[PDB]
Amino acid sequence: MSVSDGNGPITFGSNYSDEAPKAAFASLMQQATTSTTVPVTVNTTDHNTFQNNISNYLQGTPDSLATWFAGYRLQFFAAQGLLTPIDDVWDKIGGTFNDAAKSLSKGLDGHYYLVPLYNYPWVVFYNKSVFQSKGYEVPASWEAFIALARKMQSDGLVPLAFADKDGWPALGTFDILNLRINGYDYHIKLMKHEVPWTDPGVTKVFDQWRELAAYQQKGANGRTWQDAAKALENKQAGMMFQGSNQVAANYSAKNLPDLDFFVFPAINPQYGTDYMDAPTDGFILPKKGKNAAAAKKVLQYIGTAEAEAAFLKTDHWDVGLANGLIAPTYNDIQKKSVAEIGKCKSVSQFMDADTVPDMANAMIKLIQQFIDQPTPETIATVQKSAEDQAKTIFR
């Protein structure tokens, strides 16, 4: 019952199926085993299968602990009574994390269910040498952002490299516009379908996008994000908004040193740059798992700067949530990720994790339809179709 009293074996359901993260996690649990004296067994499942089978897994005979991530499904499991609360764990580790890390680790009931490990930012990337050479400043506001994009056009540059052939990349622009214009609470209400897609707030997002789109690369729907990132890297575009493990991962080693980012500019004083999509992975304690007390002891080991640094040794883009932690292995993009993500009041989890997976998929074509023809007429059509499909998806 006391974390202190938890002993004996635990199992650990893991979706770390790819070679490198598999190896990193195995090493981490061997270190946790040695330190806590709780012998940890890792049961690995194909990444996609694990998340597809999650509800059945949790209701069956799940492991003592499981890999999961913040957002919609985490909250649903908590309300279902499928997860053990870990307020006791957070009595020990709470001092290591900020308010936003705490919020994403909680259920709607205010109890903790998750111990987070890392995340990465969705931000606006750029080349330092270009900003230096051409006399650009980082824009902190919408007015400054639009003035900069117009200056980039006067200099012959595409302001924002932009691509959506892959479907998901443009969901981030919807997210960031919603977070900047309407706020985090509003965004989450919409993701959970507490607010309908026909809501005026959604209209506001697409109207702002109509202005944004004048500065976004043409023909985005036929462009892979790698090609857009290549345009930024070749200095054909001034900026590109996307996740760090995409844009920065795509750079050659020769060009990476030139890469930097800023957060999406503030639109409102009300919401400033308070919010960001920073998809966060962590660990949960399944109610039906065995040996909870020993599992809590292992979670306490996991909720440390030490555990984060050890797991991320070979990870180039993700960063730990421990408040202000700069691991000795971080590169410059990771250091700035730690600084900016840490400033956030809340971090959303990207659309595909803040809403249900079926809804984020539905949104892919509808956003593509907007990008092909960003008019008031298509906005109305997109809002109606989105609401139509939500009504059948949400139940």
From TrEMBL:
One of its GO terms (biological process) is xylan catabolic process. Keywords: Carbohydrate metabolism, Glycosidase, Hydrolase, Polysaccharide degradation, Signal, Xylan degradation. The gene is AcbH. PROSITE patterns: PROKAR_LIPOPROTEIN, TAT. This is ABC transporter binding protein AcbH. InterPro entries: Bact_solute-bd_prot1 (IPR050490), SBP (IPR006059), TAT_signal (IPR006311). It comes from Actinoplanes sp. (strain ATCC 31044 / CBS 674.73 / SE50/110). Beta-D-galactose binds at residues 47, 51, 73, 122, 246, 352-353. One of its GO terms (molecular function) is hydrolase activity, acting on glycosyl bonds. It holds the Pfam family SBP_bac_1.
